[PDB]
Design an enzyme around this catalytic site. Structure first.
Site, PDB file in Angstrom:
ATOM      1  N   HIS B  39       0.906  -1.147  -0.058  1.00 38.37           N
ATOM      2  CA  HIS B  39      -0.118   0.200  -0.061  1.00 38.37           C
ATOM      3  C   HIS B  39       0.958   1.380  -0.079  1.00 38.37           C
ATOM      4  O   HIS B  39       0.144   2.321  -0.023  1.00 38.37           O
ATOM      5  CB  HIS B  39      -1.035   0.044   1.115  1.00 38.37           C
ATOM      6  N   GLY B 141       3.289   4.791  10.813  1.00 33.84           N
ATOM      7  CA  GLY B 141       4.657   4.866  10.318  1.00 33.84           C
ATOM      8  C   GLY B 141       5.211   3.571  10.491  1.00 33.84           C
ATOM      9  O   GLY B 141       6.264   3.350  10.236  1.00 33.84           O
ATOM     10  N   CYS B 143       4.140   0.816   9.307  1.00 32.19           N
ATOM     11  CA  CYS B 143       3.993  -0.359   8.197  1.00 32.19           C
ATOM     12  C   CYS B 143       5.545  -0.700   7.928  1.00 32.19           C
ATOM     13  O   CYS B 143       6.193  -0.005   7.762  1.00 32.19           O
ATOM     14  CB  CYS B 143       3.055   0.062   7.295  1.00 32.19           C
TER      15      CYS B 143
HETATM   16  O1  LIG Z   1      -3.838   1.569  10.131  1.00 28.09           O
HETATM   17  C1  LIG Z   1      -3.034   2.131   9.086  1.00 28.09           C
HETATM   18  C2  LIG Z   1      -1.842   2.112   9.042  1.00 28.09           C
HETATM   19  N1  LIG Z   1      -1.393   1.766  10.623  1.00 28.09           N
HETATM   20  N2  LIG Z   1      -0.549   0.582  11.291  1.00 28.09           N
HETATM   21  N3  LIG Z   1      -0.366   0.524  12.254  1.00 28.09           N
HETATM   22  C3  LIG Z   1      -1.001   1.792  12.635  1.00 28.09           C
HETATM   23  C4  LIG Z   1      -1.109   2.330  13.953  1.00 28.09           C
HETATM   24  C5  LIG Z   1      -1.702   3.424  13.975  1.00 28.09           C
HETATM   25  C6  LIG Z   1      -2.303   4.257  13.025  1.00 28.09           C
HETATM   26  C7  LIG Z   1      -2.148   3.742  11.889  1.00 28.09           C
HETATM   27  C8  LIG Z   1      -1.528   2.664  11.533  1.00 28.09           C
HETATM   28  N4  LIG Z   1      -3.885   2.376   7.929  1.00 28.09           N
HETATM   29  C9  LIG Z   1      -5.356   2.717   8.038  1.00 28.09           C
HETATM   30  C10 LIG Z   1      -5.804   1.150   7.314  1.00 28.09           C
HETATM   31  C11 LIG Z   1      -6.626   0.172   8.038  1.00 28.09           C
HETATM   32  C12 LIG Z   1      -7.102  -0.968   7.453  1.00 28.09           C
HETATM   33  C13 LIG Z   1      -6.675  -1.318   6.064  1.00 28.09           C
HETATM   34  C14 LIG Z   1      -5.768  -0.550   5.606  1.00 28.09           C
HETATM   35 CL1  LIG Z   1      -4.861  -0.736   4.073  1.00 28.09          CL
HETATM   36  C15 LIG Z   1      -5.354   0.941   6.142  1.00 28.09           C
HETATM   37  C16 LIG Z   1      -3.332   2.982   6.759  1.00 28.09           C
HETATM   38  C17 LIG Z   1      -2.429   2.332   6.078  1.00 28.09           C
HETATM   39  C18 LIG Z   1      -1.966   2.814   4.904  1.00 28.09           C
HETATM   40  C19 LIG Z   1      -2.007   4.255   4.535  1.00 28.09           C
HETATM   41  C20 LIG Z   1      -1.561   4.798   3.528  1.00 28.09           C
HETATM   42  C21 LIG Z   1      -1.893   5.933   2.856  1.00 28.09           C
HETATM   43  N5  LIG Z   1      -1.430   6.080   1.535  1.00 28.09           N
HETATM   44  C22 LIG Z   1      -0.664   5.138   1.320  1.00 28.09           C
HETATM   45  N6  LIG Z   1      -0.778   3.950   2.291  1.00 28.09           N
HETATM   46  C23 LIG Z   1      -2.877   4.837   5.327  1.00 28.09           C
HETATM   47  C24 LIG Z   1      -3.512   4.427   6.495  1.00 28.09           C
END
Ligand SMILES: O=C(Cn1nnc2ccccc21)N(Cc1cccc(Cl)c1)c1ccc(-c2cnc[nH]2)cc1
Lengths: 302, 299
Positions: B39, B141, B143
Site C-alpha cells: 500500500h 509509520g 507499516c
Molecule cells: O492502519 C493503518 C496503518 N497503520 N498501521 N499501524 C498503525 C497504527 C496507528 C495508526 C495507523 C496504523 N492505515 C489504515 C488502514 C486500516 C485498514 C486497512 C488499511 Cl489498507 C489501512 C493506513 C495504512 C496505509 C495508509 C496509506 C496511505 N497512503 C498509502 N498508504 C493509510 C492508512
C-alpha cells in the site's frame, strides 16, 4: 499497553565471554577494554569468603580468556574497579557504539540483553525495584549481562548482572562496579529488603490511561506533595521526589492534568480501591512503566 | 518470568525506508531485494479503494525512493507478490543474515521489531491470535515492521505489519504477502473474528508459575481430555489436542504435574475465577507464552 525493549543490536556487537579458571561469564567489550564481574576470578570455594585484592595479585594477564565468539582477544592489562574487572585487550571493538556509563535510580527501567557464554539469548525490559533488586530472567551463566537505555544511538549502560538472591530476584552493579543496594559479591546469606510500589511509574501509567481515553478515576481533588508522600508510605508506596514531579511534566502537559491532581486521584484509588473497575484493562495498578516508557510508546522515537 | 524477545541485531541491519510519492514506511532489505507493504504505492485516495495490479503497472522504478540510513539505494526493478512489494535494488545488503520466510500458526509467538522511517524503535514478543490478529504496539509509520524468530542464527521472518483495525489490534501478512486472517489492504472498517484464548499457552504459563514457586491455583482433581475440552470451549478457549499434551510433556516431567492434572487446575480457575489473586504477577490468565518459550526461559 505492553513492555517494549530497546533494539539490542548495538549491545549485541559488544558481548564477549570471559573465562578465568573454570569460570565463564559474560563481558562487555567497548573500545579496547572488556568489563565483567570480578567474581570471575573466584573458584566455587573462594566465593564463599573471598579476598579479591589477594586473589587478583595471584592472577596474570595470561590467566584471562576473552573470546568474541570463538576468537580470542589477547589480554594486555587488567585492573579492578569496585566490583568490576577491566581487561585491556589488544583489539579495539569496531562495533563500539557511542556510549555512556550511568547510575540509575530505583524505579527506572532498562532493557537487559540476557547472554550465555557471550552469546545473546534474549532481550526484555526490567525495572530497578526500590529495594535495588530486579525481577529479571537469568539462568546460571548469565552473569555479566548488561542493562541499558538508548537515546539517539548513544547507549547508556546502567546495569551489570552479578547474582541471584534466595527469593529469586537479581542484584548487580553499575558499569563502575558499584552495587545497587546493600549487596556484596560473596556467596553469603543476603536478603532483599522489603519492596515498595514505584509511585512515579503508577502515575505514568494513569497518564497513559488518560491519553487513551480511560479517565474514570480522575477526581475533583488535589493535594500537596508532602501530604501525598506521607499517605503513600502508609500503603507501601514510594514517596515522590522533585525529580519525579519533573519527569511527569510532559504527560501532565499533554493531558492537561496537573501532577498533584493525579496524585489525589491515585490517593483515592489507594484509600477506597478500584471497585471492580479496570484501567487499561487491568484491575491492578502497573508500576514498571516510567514516564519515558509511556512517552516512548506514544512517540516514534528513532 | 518475563516476556523475552529475540535479540534484534540481525534484523536491525535489514531495515530501510521506502518512499513512494508522499507515503513513507519501512522495508526489509535482504540481498538485493527490499520487501515492503504494497500500500505504499497508494495515495490517500487510492487506499480508500485500490486496484493494486492497475496501480502497480503505472509505476516506474524511479517512483520508489529507498534509503538505508543515509545512503539512497537505486531501485532497478519492482514486482508484487500478493500484498508485498519487492523492489530490486542495485546493491546487496552486506548485513543480510541467514534467513527463511515462514508462515506461523495461530498461537505461535514471535518477536516484533517496531520501526519508523526505517529506524528501529523497540522490540517485543507477540503471539498470533486465533482470529489471526496480533496485539502489537504500533503507531503511524510502523507499516513494514517485521516479526521473526531466531534459531541458531537463522532468522525466520513470519510477519510484516500492514494496518491497525478499529479495535486497536493489528493485521499483516507473511513475507509471501498473504494476510493472516480475513483482512484486506483497503482502508475500510474491518472487524476480526471473535478471539479465543490459546489453551496450550495458558497451560505452559501455569507450569512456569509452578517452576517459579507458585502453586496456589493447583488442586487435587483430575480430568479427562474431552471433559476439559468441553469446559474449554464453553469459556471460549481453543481445544487442547493430544499433540499439545505431548508438547507439554517436558514441563509436566520437570514439575511432576500431569498435563490432565494441570487441566483440572485451569478448569477450576475458569469456573471460579481467580478470587482477586494473581499468578506470576498477572491478574488475568496469560496466553502468549508457548511451551517452547517457557522451556527455553526456564532451562
Ligand atoms: O492502519 C493503518 C496503518 N497503520 N498501521 N499501524 C498503525 C497504527 C496507528 C495508526 C495507523 C496504523 N492505515 C489504515 C488502514 C486500516 C485498514 C486497512 C488499511 Cl489498507 C489501512 C493506513 C495504512 C496505509 C495508509 C496509506 C496511505 N497512503 C498509502 N498508504 C493509510 C492508512
Amino acid at each position: 499497553f505492553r513492555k517494549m525493549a530497546f533494539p539490542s543490536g548495538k549491545v549485541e556487537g559488544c558481548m564477549v565471554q570471559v573465562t578465568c579458571g573454570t569460570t565463564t561469564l559474560n563481558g562487555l567489550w567497548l573500545d579496547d577494554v572488556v568489563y565483567c564481574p570480578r567474581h570471575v576470578i573466584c573458584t566455587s570455594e573462594d566465593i564463599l569468603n573471598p579476598n579479591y585484592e589477594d586473589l587478583l595479585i595471584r592472577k596474570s594477564n595470561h590467566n584471562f580468556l576473552v573470546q568474541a565468539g570463538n576468537v580470542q582477544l589477547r589480554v594486555i592489562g587488567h585492573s579492578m574497579q569496585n566490583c568490576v574487572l577491566k581487561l585491556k585487550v589488544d583489539t579495539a571493538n569496531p562495533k563500539t557504539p557511542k556510549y555512556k556509563f550511568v547510575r540509575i535510580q530505583p524505579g527506572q527501567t532498562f532493557s537487559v540483553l540476557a547472554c550465555y557464554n557471550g552469546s545473546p539469548s534474549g532481550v526484555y525490559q526490567c525495572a530497578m525495584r526500590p529495594n535495588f533488586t530486579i525481577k529479571g530472567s537469568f539462568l546460571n551463566g548469565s552473569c555479566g549481562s548488561v542493562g541499558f537505555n538508548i537515546d539517539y544511538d548513544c547507549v547508556s549502560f546502567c546495569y551489570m548482572h552479578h547474582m541471584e538472591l534466595p527469593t529469586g530476584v537479581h542484584a548487580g552493579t553499575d558499569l563502575e562496579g558499584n552495587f545497587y543496594g546493600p549487596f556484596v559479591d560473596r556467596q553469603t546469606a543476603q536478603a532483599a529488603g522489603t519492596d515498595t510500589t514505584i509511585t512515579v511509574n503508577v502515575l505514568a501509567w494513569l497518564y497513559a490511561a488518560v491519553i487513551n481515553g480511560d479517565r474514570w478515576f480522575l477526581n475533583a481533588r488535589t493535594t500537596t506533595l508532602n501530604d501525598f508522600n506521607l499517605v503513600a508510605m502508609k500503603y507501601n508506596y514510594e514517596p515522590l521526589t522533585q525529580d519525579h514531579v519533573d519527569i511527569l511534566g510532559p504527560l501532565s502537559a499533554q493531558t492537561g492534568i496537573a501532577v498533584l491532581d493525579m496524585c489525589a486521584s491515585l490517593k483515592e484509588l489507594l484509600q477506597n480501591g478500584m471497585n471492580g473497575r479496570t484501567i487499561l484493562g487491568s484491575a491492578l495498578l502497573e508500576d514498571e512503566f516510567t514516564p519515558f516508557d509511556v512517552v516512548r510508546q506514544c512517540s516514534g522515537v528513532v
